[PDB]
Amino acid sequence: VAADLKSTQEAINKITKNLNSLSELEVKNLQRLSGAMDELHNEILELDEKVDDLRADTISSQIELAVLLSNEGIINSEDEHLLALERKLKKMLGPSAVDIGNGSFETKHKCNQTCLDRIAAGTFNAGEFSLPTFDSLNITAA
Amino acid sequence: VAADLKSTQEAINKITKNLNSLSELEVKNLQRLSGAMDELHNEILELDEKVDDLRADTISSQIELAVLLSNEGIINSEDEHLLALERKLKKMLGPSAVDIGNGSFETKHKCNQTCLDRIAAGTFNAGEFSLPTFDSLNITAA
Amino acid sequence: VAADLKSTQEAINKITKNLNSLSELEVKNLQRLSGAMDELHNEILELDEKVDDLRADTISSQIELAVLLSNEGIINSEDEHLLALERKLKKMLGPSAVDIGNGSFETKHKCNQTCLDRIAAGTFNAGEFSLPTFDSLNITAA
């Protein structure tokens, strides 16, 4: 038995439409994954900045304690070791602008809001992904 | 020449089955990528916690050295600068519960096991992804 | 009306070819996403190492200030508290090899180049993903 023309035509039309449908749904899945990837990326950059600023915090304050100690004038025997330590600390300062040691001073800061908002308590969409399955058309004989 | 009905029917059935097969394999690929995404996410959260706890460690101990210094009574000229430094340090404490400065004290801690296990020496599945390709059926004339 | 054999054959051939095309394009999309995933992973490992080395930096220098303070001999009343603090600090040292406290000393370091190059100013490919859509063939009657 032969196959009806129109029938077969509509069948193949349905398969092509199924293919395009699956294709566009697939690009949507890719774009969702992509969005999540970008989120991860932002969280990482912000965490890095957080680490920089912690470096600046702790090293800055250690420097201030060292300077204060010099100024008091009670480090006599170990004064050279103190100077050297101050040198090391300045050498360990965060990758940013920071004011002189002598006395007190501010330091680096580069990460706000999402820095503390992206990673700390941030709802992360999991991975429920689906794609359609399709039925075949019954091509009827002419 | 016309096309055999049954033949064409089985052909289209095979194409639809190929399409569903590819579809379900594709969702599996998406779910694997998704799993890896979640892993990255966990590693990031744990690293963040690690940074918090380091902040608490270093700032806590700097505070203790400052308090000890006050208690010794040898900071006379720079005593106000010392108080101020203690204020700054308390202001820099990690985002968590920490006991009074005077004397010694504990501090923040929020990240165990995988915190040191997820990122430090953790086998990360790479990206070997594949999908099937399919053959066309020879539709035989009636 | 019946459907021409050859015509239908070429139609189904085109649909199968469309399916294989979409399939291979899809694996390419997966491999691109996978590459980006690996990048994120590397950035994370490097950030972790960065955190380790900051720990070593700050804790090492706090230890040195404590030792210097002992050596000066001006911590008399609080000398036990100082010893204890040194113990705590050594207990907080980074997960790596570090030389004795007394005097000065070096410490942990495990992350170079990309450690400061991967996350700090690194162009991250976004998510422009596409897949083809296909046309259906007009099967002509015999």
Domain limits, chain C: 1-142
How far apart are the CA of A87 and the nearest CA of chain C, in angstroms? 11
- Which residues neighbour B55 within 8 Å (Cβ) at sequence distance 6 or greater? A54, A57, A58, B92, B93, B94, B108
Tokens of A93: 């300062």
Inter-axis angle of helices C79-91 and C5-72, nearest 10: 160
**Way the structure was solved:** X-ray
Q: Is B85 on the interface with A (CB under 8 A)?
A: yes
CB pair distance less than 8 Å for B68 and C85: yes
Q: Is C137 on the interface with A (CB under 8 A)?
A: yes
Q: Is C74 on the interface with A (CB under 8 A)?
A: yes
Q: Which residues of B touch A34 (CB under 8 A)?
A: none
Q: Between A and C, how many residue pairs show a Cβ–Cβ distance under 8 A?
A: 145
Query: How far apart are the C-alpha atoms of A66 and A55, rounded to whole Å?
Result: 16
Query: How far apart are the C-alpha atoms of A129 and B30, rounded to whole Å?
Result: 7
CB pair distance less than 8 Å for A30 and C126: no
B57 and B109 Cβ atoms separated by less than 8 Å: no
B56 and B108 Cβ atoms separated by less than 8 Å: yes
Q: Which residues of A touch C74 (CB under 8 A)?
A: 74-75
How many CA atoms does the CB half-sphere of C95 hold within 13 Å?
A: 12
Q: Which residues of B touch A26 (CB under 8 A)?
A: 26
Q: Is A134 on the interface with B (CB under 8 A)?
A: yes
Q: Is C30 on the interface with B (CB under 8 A)?
A: yes
- Which residues neighbour B27 within 8 Å (Cβ) at sequence distance 6 or greater? A129, A130, A131
Torsion-angle region of residue A113: left (phi > 0), alpha (psi -120 to 50) or beta?
Answer: left
CB pair distance less than 8 Å for B8 and A3: yes
- Which residues neighbour C62 within 8 Å (Cβ) at sequence distance 6 or greater? A62, B58, B61, B62, B65, C89
Q: Is C5 on the interface with A (CB under 8 A)?
A: no
